[PDB]
Amino acid sequence: IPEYVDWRQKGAVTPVKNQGSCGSCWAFSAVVTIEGIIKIRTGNLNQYSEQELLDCDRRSYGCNGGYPWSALQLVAQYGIHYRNTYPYEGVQRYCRSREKGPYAAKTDGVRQVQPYNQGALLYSIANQPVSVVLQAAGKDFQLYRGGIFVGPCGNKVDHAVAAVGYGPNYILIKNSWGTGWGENGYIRIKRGTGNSYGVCGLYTSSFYPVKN
């Protein structure tokens, strides 16, 4: 369980993206999750469509609300297309999955990490990236243009992102905003403080598919 875990230089995460004026970080967080695992075994890095997840997942409320843990489940159940055969537009619409044709990616299950346990988060993040939530409605996290976020912030979780590494002290997160935020679309939050919930409630509820 290395002292350092970066999947970027591991060839697991692709360039950064923006959800835009679409409340859809859940579907984006997911595509990165599935994505990671998909490349971890096969040795093939891919960019899947979040747009599809939006238009297809009726359980989620597309362009403004969702469950990073429906998306995944969805995929495993059905599947998911490339981000070319289903590029992101930013507006929820009619499911094209079927109309689009044969799927391209399809997992083999979804599991959740025991909330409120850093030790647990890491491990999984060590075996493969994960979808995690937190407080973004933040007025500080909103302004982050590089650094190690400690706060201030709260325990009112309401935005989903992704963890793509950690250090002895900083946890790495991929944001669904442009590369005109944090440190090039990236933000480092601090771990090991005692805060069980985890600063910004980053330890509330996390997840991930399964792959054979």
- Reported resolution in A? 2.8
Catalytic amino acids? 25, 159, 175
Closest alpha carbon to 106 in 131, 83, 73? 73
Output the 3-class SS for the chain. Answer: CCCCEECCCCCCCCCCCCCCCCCCHHHHHHHHHHHHHHHHHCCCCCCECHHHHHHHCCCCCCCCCCCHHHHHHHHHHCCECECCCCCCCCCCCCCCHHHHCCCCECCCCEEEECCCCHHHHHHHHHHCCEEEEECCCCCCCCCCCCCEECCCCCCCCCEEEEEEEECCCEEEEECCCCCCCCCCCEEEEECCCCCCCCHHHCCCCEEEECCC
25 is in an annotated binding site: yes
* 76 Cβ contact list (under 8 Å, min separation 6): 106, 107, 108, 109, 110, 209, 210
Structural domains of the chain sorted by starting position, each given as residue range(s) with its CATH number in brackets: 1-212 (3.90.70.10)
